[PDB]
Design an enzyme around this catalytic site. Sequence first.
Site, PDB file in Angstrom:
ATOM      1  N   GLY A  24     -10.133 -52.021   8.036  1.00  0.00           N
ATOM      2  CA  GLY A  24      -9.260 -51.205   7.028  1.00  0.00           C
ATOM      3  C   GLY A  24      -9.501 -49.808   7.032  1.00  0.00           C
TER       4      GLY A  24
ATOM      5  N   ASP B 130     -14.049 -53.366  21.603  1.00  0.00           N
ATOM      6  CA  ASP B 130     -14.086 -54.627  20.893  1.00  0.00           C
ATOM      7  C   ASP B 130     -15.243 -55.603  21.530  1.00  0.00           C
ATOM      8  OD1 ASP B 130     -12.171 -53.184  19.930  1.00  0.00           O
ATOM      9  OD2 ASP B 130     -10.653 -54.722  19.770  1.00  0.00           O
TER      10      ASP B 130
ATOM     11  N   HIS C 136     -16.180 -52.554  16.489  1.00  0.00           N
ATOM     12  CA  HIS C 136     -15.361 -51.529  17.431  1.00  0.00           C
ATOM     13  C   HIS C 136     -15.645 -50.080  16.899  1.00  0.00           C
ATOM     14  CE1 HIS C 136     -12.069 -51.005  14.616  1.00  0.00           C
ATOM     15  NE2 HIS C 136     -11.629 -52.029  14.756  1.00  0.00           N
TER      16      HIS C 136
ATOM     17  N   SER D 210     -14.565 -54.501  12.160  1.00  0.00           N
ATOM     18  CA  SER D 210     -15.174 -53.223  12.143  1.00  0.00           C
ATOM     19  C   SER D 210     -15.700 -52.871  10.656  1.00  0.00           C
ATOM     20  CB  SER D 210     -14.373 -52.260  12.787  1.00  0.00           C
ATOM     21  OG  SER D 210     -13.199 -52.051  11.936  1.00  0.00           O
ATOM     22  N   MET D 211     -15.072 -52.907   9.930  1.00  0.00           N
ATOM     23  CA  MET D 211     -15.243 -52.553   8.492  1.00  0.00           C
ATOM     24  C   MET D 211     -16.174 -53.419   7.744  1.00  0.00           C
ATOM     25  SD  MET D 211     -14.936 -49.137   7.453  1.00  0.00           S
ATOM     26  CE  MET D 211     -16.607 -49.029   6.972  1.00  0.00           C
TER      27      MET D 211
END
Lengths: 45, 166, 338, 111, 100, 56, 56, 192, 191
Positions: I67, I170, I121, I96-97
């Site tokens: 996000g 990624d 990523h 990622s987050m």
Amino acid sequence: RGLRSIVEAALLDTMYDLPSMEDVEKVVIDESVIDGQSEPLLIYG
Amino acid sequence: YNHYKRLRNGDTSNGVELGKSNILLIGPTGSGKTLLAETLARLLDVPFTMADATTLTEAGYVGEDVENIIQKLLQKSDYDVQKAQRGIVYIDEIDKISRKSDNPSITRDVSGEGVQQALLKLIEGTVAAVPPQGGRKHPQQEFLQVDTSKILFICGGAFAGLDKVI
Amino acid sequence: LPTPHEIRNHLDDYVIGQEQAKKVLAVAVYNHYKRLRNGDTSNGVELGKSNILLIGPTGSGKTLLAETLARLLDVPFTMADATTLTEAGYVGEDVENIIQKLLQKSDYDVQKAQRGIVYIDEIDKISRGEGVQQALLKLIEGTVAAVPPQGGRKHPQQEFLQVDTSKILFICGGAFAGLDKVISHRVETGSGIGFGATVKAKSDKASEGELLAQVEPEDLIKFGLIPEFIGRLPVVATLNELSEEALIQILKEPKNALTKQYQALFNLEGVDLEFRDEALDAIAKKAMARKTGARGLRSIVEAALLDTMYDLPSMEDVEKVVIDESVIDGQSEPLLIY
Amino acid sequence: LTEAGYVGEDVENIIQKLLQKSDYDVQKAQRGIVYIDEIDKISRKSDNPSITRDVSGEGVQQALLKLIEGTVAAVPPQGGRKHPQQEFLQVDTSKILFICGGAFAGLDKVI
Amino acid sequence: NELSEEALIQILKEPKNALTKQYQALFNLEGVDLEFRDEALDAIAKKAMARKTGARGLRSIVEAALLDTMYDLPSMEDVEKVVIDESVIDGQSEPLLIYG
Amino acid sequence: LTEAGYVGEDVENIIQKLLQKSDYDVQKAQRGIVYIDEIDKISRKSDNPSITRDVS
Amino acid sequence: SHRVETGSGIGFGATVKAKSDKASEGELLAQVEPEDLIKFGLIPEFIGRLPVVATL
Amino acid sequence: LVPMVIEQTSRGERSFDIYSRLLKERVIFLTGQVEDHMANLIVAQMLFLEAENPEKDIYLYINSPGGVITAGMSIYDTMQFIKPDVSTICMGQAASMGAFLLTAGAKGKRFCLPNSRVMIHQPLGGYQGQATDIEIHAREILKVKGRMNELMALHTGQSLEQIERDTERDRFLSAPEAVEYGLVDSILTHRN
Amino acid sequence: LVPMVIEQTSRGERSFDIYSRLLKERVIFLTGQVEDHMANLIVAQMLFLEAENPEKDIYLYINSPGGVITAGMSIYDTMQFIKPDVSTICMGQAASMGAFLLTAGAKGKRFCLPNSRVMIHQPLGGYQGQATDIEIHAREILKVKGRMNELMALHTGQSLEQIERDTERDRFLSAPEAVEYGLVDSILTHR
Ligand SMILES: Nc1ncnc2c1ncn2[C@@H]1O[C@H](COP(=O)(O)OP(=O)(O)O)[C@@H](O)[C@H]1O
Ligand SMILES: Nc1ncnc2c1ncn2[C@@H]1O[C@H](COP(=O)(O)OP(=O)(O)O)[C@@H](O)[C@H]1O
């Protein structure tokens, strides 16, 4: 009945120490004692 | 000291009739409220007793009656009303008798407001019918007329939440 | 006035597996009797009563510890239940009635009755009625209760016997099942649902023994007990649990053991009795599942021996009788020797 | 005071107290005065149906309805000297003045 | 007014029926003197305040600290006096026993 | 059966009744058997304001 | 019954107990314990003094 | 809307939702498209029941058309982690994800209604972008396919080769056929 | 419709939603796309629990496809700011987050389920406007990338150069791979 509470509070400390005091011929209470700013006057014979 | 003076001045040579002033000990639990009452019985010459307000209930109910307070004072007084009239009384946990809030009273609160209504005449002074011992009020004639006019009362309780009100 | 160590030895004869609790009661009861024994009170200082608070599971030996002490030091012993006095109606009559029951065994003697040991159980149930606790604390702190003189058709208020409860030792036993969770929350991690929480609810409760030993006033107030009542119970004794192996010992190790009682009954009849160790585990296992502790032992053994007791007197030539685990199950019949 | 048949004191006890001052003289008692304090306490709690019997409340009023106007009250002869042969004294309260008094807290809101 | 930590310390020794004097007399009759160091009184008061038990809690704290000695002191011999200090309150060290 | 000193009955008379059956012989009387029927009818009950006392 | 009644489940695999096979006085009094008798009103000491229990 | 129900207890009458009432009896409802939001709700229900009684079994009712693999995989790991056995019942249908959770139930406790339809297919996904990124996502989804087939073979008991061929395309299995395949154990035709 | 659960204690019985009942056990649920509103809610739970007890550990269940980066930093800074150790458990996946918050947990208290998928990523962003403004925004996102890589290297323990090459595109990871990489400490297979 509220009057009794006001008088007892004012003379609470006085009556506590009054018997030990000597030759206390008279006591005077004034408006200054009611609010508490002043202490009742004690006259010694 | 004033109480002894009133009893000492029982003769009442002067027309003036000495009044009675009751004490209300308000303090947190564990502050020695009960201890103060117990420390007086040692030196007190007149009969002294201790009770609990929570047990007391309005008349006509299965809980208890306020007149039973005098029964305890009579035990120490050897059931002698003459000297018991010059006694002192201590009532603990008086805070529990207070009404809580927004009560219509339709339920006819017994543990609370009812107890206060009965004590009113008792504190100021009224003749009370006290059973001999271990008895409950009934039409029987087993009663003892005791006057509470000269009997001092010291109601001590921990009014939790009163600080917020103040 | 035997020493606490000597008192513990007597308790060890009839009670086993609660050595730690015996130590607390031995020292506490020794002090109470020492105060009564030291009735002179020459110095101005006034000795204060110490009341014990027993926290243990059902059938752990709380009640047995009470009367065992009285048997050693002859004194009247009475038992009461908090559920009986939870009516909250004219509580003064029932609390003094407890003293009346004690006086029955004390020959209605105030001096002898004052030395009695009172016991109460199921104190957790009243904790939440709040009002009943208000009356109970007065009895523990000390109060004078008038009682009629040795019954009678009727008697006047003067003849009424007044007994001071300040000199009587009160033991308020109880079983706080939910208190263990409160202690774990305060002492151990406060996680019971998540992945990292401890949900090993195997029912072993081995941790409960040492966990309940850390009982403090904080956990009691959470349970609902008022602080005033807790203060009057400074001494605290904690029983951990009765294990399956411990039950086997209770069957034979005690002086008035259950097996010895039945063995004597058969001996006078004219036939001896033998209890194999295999049968003991079967009885102990049944008691553990039932959750009755040592109480169920008497019922389990009586039922097993009911069939033989009915036919053994009529039957003859039975030189000896033996029992095994199969007999406890009920499928088999007790072996008979000829 | 409470309704008859309950632990609380009965209404007729009031006449017994008046007989102690007159040396248990019915004639002098029938012409006596009476004062009933805290009369506001015996009041229905704004519930006309009164689901539960208010022996301490509404019940007391009903018992006093006929006493004030006049009733032949029954009381012990002389402080219950001996329970056998009671011969309860007959006292008529038709001529006995009654002065009730109490602090009706909340009446101002109604008025 | 509510009691303070300093007041709790006074209650342990100043009162005529002080809790400390009760245990001292209990030991004096046996023939063994008893003494409480000021370091221990402060720790006892802190525990009561820490647990919010108040003055009533003082009895429980003293009972636990002297539980071991009271059990063994009657059976033991040649014990002229017992000394207690702050180390006893936390439980790290057993109460010092003096031999005659 | 009722509490002692009341109009109902006294529990102690049960022993006396057993003696009449055994002709007052203490020896054989101790070997007698007692049957207290309707034991559940004396179950403990809460206090009643109307009743003077719970004798049973 | 209040003490030894397991209760009826709601799921597919639960055991449903119909009123026909709910319970009966027989096989229920056999599981009597001192705690239930105390609730009836009997004194705990009185129950302890009666170890033998004959249930019909 | 949801109809409230009353439960009788020692304290007194208590009000419970129809779903909450069944949750008290260790019954969890898996309904609709499998998504992250509902999966966390089921996971919370499982963990809560574990604390109350880790010995008693849990009954999972599966009636859904499938959904996300990541969300569904969070429930599978939760079921295997907790000690209590998780019983799985198929109501109406059990698609790709619903079938994996159905067969993932405790051995011997998996059930299916007689008219339920169990459909299983291979994972489907898509990506848009550069060829380098497509290779990364293509390798990832293929690994997931082998991972899901490996686990499906373990519970059903069939060889990995057979599962791979059968799941290459949509395959519908009736309640009796599922028993032979190994997805379930018994059929709850009528209460006994 | 979230279900209601009853908690029974000596004091009484209380009714709570499933999410609120678990909050009492210091369990916070992170679900869906990270954003300012949901992140603010998680932060409020951390501060509330800190006040109740600053010593007990806090658990965080992470299941989210990433996000907004700014919202994520608020949670990360909050976890490190508060004294209690924040445990992280990966359920389903952690993008990622989510992965940054997962590895941000206290050392030795980072877990992941066996079938969880972890993907990391570089940040994604875009700006439309004048060339001068583009350079300003382009410099900002690059600083965030270097800043995030530095923090990830610190928790994971890998070199900064290794984290730059791996996070360029990624990189899907599995639970065992995450353990060796350093994102997590151990796997919770069974109880
Ligand atoms: N200053 C004090 N000195 C001695 N004991 C005290 C003191 N203050 C409080 N206490 C203790 O307080 C208790 C008596 O009061 P308490 O029962 O707490 O009152 P209440 O019932 O009104 O809460 C005893 O344990 C007594 O020793
Ligand atoms: N160690 C033991 N040795 C002999 N009998 C025991 C032992 N422990 C328990 N019992 C027997 O089992 C009973 C257990 O129940 P009891 O002590 O009354 O406690 P509770 O009321 O909590 O069940 C004892 O009273 C006694 O009859």
